[PDB]
Amino acid sequence: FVEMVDNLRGKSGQGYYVEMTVGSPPQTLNILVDTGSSNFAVGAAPHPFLHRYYQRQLSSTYRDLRKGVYVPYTQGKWEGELGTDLVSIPHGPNVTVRANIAAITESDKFFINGSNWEGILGLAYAEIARPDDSLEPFFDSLVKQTHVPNLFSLQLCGSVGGSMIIGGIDHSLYTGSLWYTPIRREWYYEVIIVRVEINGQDLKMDCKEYNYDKSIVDSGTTNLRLPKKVFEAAVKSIKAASSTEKFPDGFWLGEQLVCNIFPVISLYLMGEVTNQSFRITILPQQYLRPVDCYKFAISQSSTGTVMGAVIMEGFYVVFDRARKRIGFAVSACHVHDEFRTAAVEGPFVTLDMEDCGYN
Ligand SMILES: Cc1noc(C)c1[C@@H]1C[C@@](C)(c2ccc(F)cc2F)N=C(N)S1
């Protein structure tokens, strides 16, 4: 998978993108890699922010599905026209598939001014695909039409770079062993957090609170998002551990910037075996992001835990769809100092892990 190494690019806070081609003859586009959605949607109109866009008139293999799609988010929205066309990934497997494409004709607060991507690749499951689950996501189409194994892995490195290994695992991209957590449900990449530690000190919360209403792995989100009750207990512990320096309350809420003291954060994830778990540990270098101006990149959430770039940049993450599991291993590219490094450790004994999942 050497040709797939270093196939991700981007700028800080603007996400990670991969080069893709769409149509015949192939039209080159930069496409954001997003494990938190399920639509393959591309700019198809000359929006001022876009370097380029999908021109359906130039493609002889384009097929109109004669259906519109309106996708609103919490922050922004896009509207598109649904169709199918031939899609390939130049720095991926040597294959071409017919995939669903939402041609974006109208948007608000979706594209980033100054970014180098013009589309989004939803890598999650059909259940959260829009308008409904009958619209087959790209990766489902890829696995069905080719002999590409039902697996992909992401190494996101902290302008920015990384690797999306499609159909396999590159062992040079991680150190130590991979540790797997079950995918609870095939919609988002939903996982179960069973324990949270700040500098080794347990938060002592009902583990159901950590997964209210869900916990997901999302490459399209920057922050580690936590449920508000978990966030408040987490921040209080981080404040106590970093009592050497005094910071304004706005900094902790992400309302202001600040220009060894900060604690490590450990998330225990449900293991593959009954009563067995493992832990992933991140550093201040992950959750305190440069904007020297630093932004506290842990925030409160209404939609449950989001393991965004803050988590993913510390680890090599394997999305093992074939076995309904997500693998975590220490990333060979993660940012650390001489005293502390990111870690994946196990096994640990954790009882009543099924009670941690919200129903
Ligand atoms: C859900 C949700 N609610 O508010 C926001 C913002 C989202 C993001 C939606 C999406 C599609 C997204 C990501 C990056 C980007 F640049 C634009 C996007 F639209 N992927 C996610 N994972 S989170």
Swiss-Prot record:
Description of what induces expression: Up-regulated by the Ca(2+)-regulated transcription factor NFATC4.
Regulation (activators, inhibitors): Inhibited by RTN3 and RTN4.
Keyword DNA-binding: no
Gene Ontology MF term list: amyloid-beta binding; aspartic-type endopeptidase activity; beta-aspartyl-peptidase activity; endopeptidase activity; enzyme binding; peptidase activity; protein serine/threonine kinase binding
Sugar attachment sites: N94, N113, N275
Superkingdom, taxonomy of origin: Eukaryota
Membrane topology category: Single-pass type I membrane protein
Gene Ontology CC annotations of this record: axon; cell surface; dendrite; early endosome; endoplasmic reticulum lumen; endosome; endosome membrane; Golgi apparatus
Keywords: Acetylation, Aspartyl protease, Cell membrane, Cell projection, Cytoplasmic vesicle, Disulfide bond, Endoplasmic reticulum, Endosome, Glycoprotein, Golgi apparatus, Hydrolase, Isopeptide bond, Lipoprotein, Lysosome, Membrane, Palmitate, Phosphoprotein, Protease, Signal, Transmembrane, Transmembrane helix, Ubl conjugation, Zymogen
Changes after translation: N-Glycosylated. Addition of a bisecting N-acetylglucosamine by MGAT3 blocks lysosomal targeting, further degradation and is required for maintaining stability under stress conditions. Acetylated in the endoplasmic reticulum at Lys-67, Lys-204, Lys-208, Lys-214, Lys-228, Lys-229 and Lys-236. Acetylation by NAT8 and NAT8B is transient and deacetylation probably occurs in the Golgi. Acetylation regulates the maturation, the transport to the plasma membrane, the stability and the expression of the protein.
Primary subcellular site in the record, as a coarse category: membrane
Domain remarks in the Swiss-Prot or TrEMBL record: DXXLL motif is required for a proper endocytosis and retrograde transport to the trans-Golgi network, as well as for regulation of lysosomal degradation.
Similarity annotation: Belongs to the peptidase A1 family.
Described function: Responsible for the proteolytic processing of the amyloid precursor protein (APP). Cleaves at the N-terminus of the A-beta peptide sequence, between residues 671 and 672 of APP, leads to the generation and extracellular release of beta-cleaved soluble APP, and a corresponding cell-associated C-terminal fragment which is later released by gamma-secretase. Cleaves CHL1.
Protein name, per record: Beta-secretase 1
Species classification: Eukaryota, Metazoa, Chordata, Craniata, Vertebrata
Gene name of the record: BACE1
First and last residues shown, out of full length: 60 to 446 of 501
